[PDB]
Amino acid sequence: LYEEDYKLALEAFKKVFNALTHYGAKQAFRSRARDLVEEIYNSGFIPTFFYIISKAELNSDSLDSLISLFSSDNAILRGSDENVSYSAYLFIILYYLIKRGIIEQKFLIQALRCEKTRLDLIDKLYNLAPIISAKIRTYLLAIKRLSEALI
Amino acid sequence: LVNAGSGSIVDYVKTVLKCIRENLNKCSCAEKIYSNEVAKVMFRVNVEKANVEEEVKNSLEYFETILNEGRIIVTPAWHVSISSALNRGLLVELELVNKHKGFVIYAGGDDLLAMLPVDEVLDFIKESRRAFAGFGTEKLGNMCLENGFVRINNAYYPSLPIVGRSYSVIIAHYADPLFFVINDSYNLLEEGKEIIRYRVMYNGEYKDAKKDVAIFRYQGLTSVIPLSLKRPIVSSVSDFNEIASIIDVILELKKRIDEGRISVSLLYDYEKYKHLIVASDEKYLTEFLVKDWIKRNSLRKHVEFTIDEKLYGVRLTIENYPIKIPNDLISNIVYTLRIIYGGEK
Amino acid sequence: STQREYVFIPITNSITIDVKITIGGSDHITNIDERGIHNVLVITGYAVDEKNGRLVPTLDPCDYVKGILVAGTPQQAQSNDFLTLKLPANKLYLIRKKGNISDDLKIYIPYSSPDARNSMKTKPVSISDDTIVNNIIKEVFDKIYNITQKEKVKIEKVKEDIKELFSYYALEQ
Amino acid sequence: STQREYVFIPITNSITIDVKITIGGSDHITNIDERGIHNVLVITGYAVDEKNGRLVPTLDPCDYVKGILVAGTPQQAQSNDFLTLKLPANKLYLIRKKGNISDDLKIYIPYSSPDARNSMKTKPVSISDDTIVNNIIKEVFDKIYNITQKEKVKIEKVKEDIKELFSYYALEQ
Amino acid sequence: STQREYVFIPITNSITIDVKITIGGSDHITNIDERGIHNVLVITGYAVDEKNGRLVPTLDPCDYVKGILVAGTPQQAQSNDFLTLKLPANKLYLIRKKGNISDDLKIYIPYSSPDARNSMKTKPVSISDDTIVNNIIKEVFDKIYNITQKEKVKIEKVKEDIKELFSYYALEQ
Ligand SMILES: [Mn+2]
Numbered sequence A: 001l002y003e004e005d006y007k008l009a010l011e012a013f014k015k016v017f018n019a020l021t022h023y024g025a026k027q028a029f030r031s032r033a034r035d036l037v038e039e040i041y042n043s044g045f046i047p048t049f050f051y052i053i054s055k056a057e058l059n060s061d062s063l064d065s066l067i068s069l070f071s072s073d074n075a076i077l078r079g080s081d082e083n084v085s086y087s088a089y090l091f092i093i094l095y096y097l098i099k100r101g102i103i104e105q106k107f108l109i110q111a112l113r114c115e116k117t118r119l120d121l122i123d124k125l126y127n128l129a130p131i132i133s134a135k136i137r138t139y140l141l142a143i144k145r146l147s148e149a150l151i
Numbered sequence B: 001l002v003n004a005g006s007g008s009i010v011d012y013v014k015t016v017l018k019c020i021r022e023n024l025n026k027c028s029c030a031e032k033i034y035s036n037e038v039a040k041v042m043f044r045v046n047v048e049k050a051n052v053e054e055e056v057k058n059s060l061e062y063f064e065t066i067l068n069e070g071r072i073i074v075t076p077a078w079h080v081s082i083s084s085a086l087n088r089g090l091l092v093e094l095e096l097v098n099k100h101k102g103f104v105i106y107a108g109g110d111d112l113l114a115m116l117p118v119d120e121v122l123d124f125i126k127e128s129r130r131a132f133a134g135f136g137t138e139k140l141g142n143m144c145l146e147n148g149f150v151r152i153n154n155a156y157y158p159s160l161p162i163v164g165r166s167y168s169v170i171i172a173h174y175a176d177p178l179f180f181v182i183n184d185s186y187n188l189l190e191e192g193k194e195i196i197r198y199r200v201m202y203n204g205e206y207k208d209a210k211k212d213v214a215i216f217r218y219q220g221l222t223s224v225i226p227l228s229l230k231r232p233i234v235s236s237v238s239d240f241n242e243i244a245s246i247i248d249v250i251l252e253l254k255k256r257i258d259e260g261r262i263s264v265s266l267l268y269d270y271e272k273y274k275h276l277i278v279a280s281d282e283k284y285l286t287e288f289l290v291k292d293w294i295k296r297n298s299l300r301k302h303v304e305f306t307i308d309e310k311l312y313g314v315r316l317t318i319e320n321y322p323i324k325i326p327n328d329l330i331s332n333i334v335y336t337l338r339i340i341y342g343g344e345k
Numbered sequence C, D, E: 001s002t003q004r005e006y007v008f009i010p011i012t013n014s015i016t017i018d019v020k021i022t023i024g025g026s027d028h029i030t031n032i033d034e035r036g037i038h039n040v041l042v043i044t045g046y047a048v049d050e051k052n053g054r055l056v057p058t059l060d061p062c063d064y065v066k067g068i069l070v071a072g073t074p075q076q077a078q079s080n081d082f083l084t085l086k087l088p089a090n091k092l093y094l095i096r097k098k099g100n101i102s103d104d105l106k107i108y109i110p111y112s113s114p115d116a117r118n119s120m121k122t123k124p125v126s127i128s129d130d131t132i133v134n135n136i137i138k139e140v141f142d143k144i145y146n147i148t149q150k151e152k153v154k155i156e157k158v159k160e161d162i163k164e165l166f167s168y169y170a171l172e173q
Helices: A005-011 A028-040 A045-053 A061-070 A087-099 A105-111 A115-127 A129-149 B010-020 B034-041 B052-069 B076-099 B121-132 B178-192 B247-257 B264-268 B271-277 B283-295 B329-342 C130-139 C159-165 D131-137 D155-165 E130-139 E156-165
Strands: B103-106 B113-115 B144-146 B149-152 B155-158 B167-170 B196-201 B206-209 B213-218 B221-226 B316-318 C005-008 C040-044 C046-048 C055-057 C064-070 C082-087 C105-110 C123-125 C168-170 D004-008 D040-044 D046-048 D055-057 D064-071 D082-085 D107-110 E004-006 E040-044 E046-049 E054-057 E064-071 E085-087 E105-107 E123-126 E167-170
Touching (some): A005 A129, A005 B271, A028 A045, A028 A129, A045 A087, A045 A129, A061 A087, A087 A105, A129 B271, B010 B034, B076 B149, B121 B167, B121 B329, B178 B213, B196 B221, B213 B329, B221 B329, B247 B264, B264 B329, B271 B283, C046 C064, C064 C168, C130 C159, E046 E064, E064 E167
Parallel strands (some): C005 C105
Antiparallel strands (some): B144 B149, B196 B206, C040 C064, C082 C105, C123 C168, E004 E064, E046 E054, E123 E167
């Protein structure tokens, strides 16, 4: 079933290997992979999604060179504190969520474009936490493997 | 045709072909080439009569005959030259089988039917395939084989390097009925060798190939190992090491699991790596991935296997037969290892 | 270098008004060495206009006309209706080539316009009516090369190869 | 009707100013059918002069230069330096043949003065260094058939066709 | 009886400090004479032990070595572990006999010790790894003959001959 996921682990990626340059917050991505995956499948998708958004603000260059990876290629997400380099995993989750129709690019795009709607996006995710955690399982474990292989 | 005959005629011959090439009409073009002969026929005086007006026409008539029939026209010289190299290869594989403690039931030229222990079957297949092409390392009696020829004490006889040879190994219990064992071996060979296709590169372009496979079976486990990876299997001397270059990869991997450096879990672990290794189009990523699949199952400090990265993307297929076969060479390798090791049960 | 001349073997008597003096250099490419004519030359992609005999430039790979490289100069005022050229004898279509290779030839060959109004339907030609073979042996095989009918009366060894070898493409229109 | 003309294709410059009427009639003989350049013209005997680009012929049939045939009237003022030939296309040396034509045509080929005061030594100079096919694909591959850059994203295909197909003999003088 | 020195070519980068003056006679047995290398020396019953690359005397006729016979002296300090012998130049087994005949020749074979404790399972290994060819022509095929890479740039005629004619035996033990 999830055989297309192993290609999505690339066409979403587009780069998180030197767009995440300088080997600091780059080699921190293996931590993201392993720990976040383990915690999503022990704690939950919501307790982890909160923890992830807390490390990446709204309406800033984070959002700029996060949505820039929706219609562009060169997005050097550089910055030492994992806040532009923490939106890596956030974008990883969001690209899957949109390209698998779990949530629609209409609602998401229009939602992360004004403060009123981030609450509603987060509530929508809360309503789809089990579905998302079940589907994104293999797509994420693939990146936990891709890290310990390449990253 | 251009490449046969160094002499002074090769240029003449390729000019004849330039004539034939693009259907230049009957002798409506030979005026381009008869020159290249009539300038040369008059280098000698003892030539009695003049007969160069037609022989240049018969030459391109013959070359067009070949190129338009699509096959080299056979002559008795062709047949004796073939079926003598066939018996020479017979004499070579005879001493090859005896080297690996085998027992030759029958081995005539192309065919072979021998019983070997499951331990020296990969080694034997590698050696016998490379020798059938006429390329080896040791002397096999008095047939001292050398890179496409067979040197018998300074006499160079040719071999069959361009010919493909298939294999069909059956790992059978000593008590299995030989009737069904022989029938299944013959059937696997004659059937699988004509129904399975693997990704081969032809003039720098991936196509599909049919023959040169090694079909292992063990009571329900099957695996296919290509032995060509180039559809004209040999066109230079660089090709003679590509021959069965996967069987020595499987050998290297077998001599890591004996030494206890790699665990047999390596054979029960590749699946959770293939689903990612096949959807990939980046070489230097697949290399890391296989290194991690080997890293996770090694037992010593740091093993080194380094699959040759020309096996990645090799896609085996089938025309819907009851033979089940993984569609990638890297998984057929582990299935071949599972078969071999089941042979030591 | 030795300056030469080129004239062909047509089935018409358009050879006579082509040259002033038969000789004028030191030697020839074309020879007769008691085994018949040596060093015949053919040129590809052309043909004779048997009336006012010259060369027509075609582009058929089959087209070819056989002519003789004699030592001369065609009336000392041409190079406007005969072609002027220089070939280093490394690029000659020299049949029965037995004589020396001068390695630098300056040649005068007939060459004019094709008059591209009709289709140059050019066909082969054979030198039949052997009376004309004799007459042409009287034409050039004697006036250009004097050495005939003096050193050998045996023309019958050289009378048949003129019919055999000398064959070209004729416009016939 | 279809008065064709020839264009030679060496690696050299000064090929786009060869003519003024480029498209000419409705079509040409050559065509690119998204598989290969069909009906490619090669002449047996003509060779290009390195200065004042045109084809000067050499008697050796082994001398040859390739090109394609286009349909047009060169510059409205040439055909005084271009040999006009009238052939039925049965004598045409076309390579990479695809189909057939109306069986009656007329060609204007670039022919150059021979320059007899120098010998004719020709070497085969072929096409490579794809920067040299760039100014052929942009200049004289578009100008002949403006169909390019419209549906055929396969200019790489025709680039390789040129890479394997085209050569000539140069005088290098 | 001009003194020459036999040098061979294994895959190793080992033939560098062996002949200080790559000459010492008035000619060279070997010759690259427009067809490639010619007059190569072949010896039967030996094999090159690439580690400290030198020949080794065994008894097997399956084993042979090939190397270019050149002129020079054995490091002006050898004949302790090297070899020093003479030859009548007639009993020889030459590849492409095209060069001179000395009729009396003293040569020096780079030679190694038996070390009769390891069983010499010898394998045939001809030249591979084209880079070793291309830096061998730099290391040896330019220090023996200045004509190489000065008069001729056409080095391909020895390039393929390196792979075709130089085949030795590797002990790999
Ligand atoms: Mn059969």
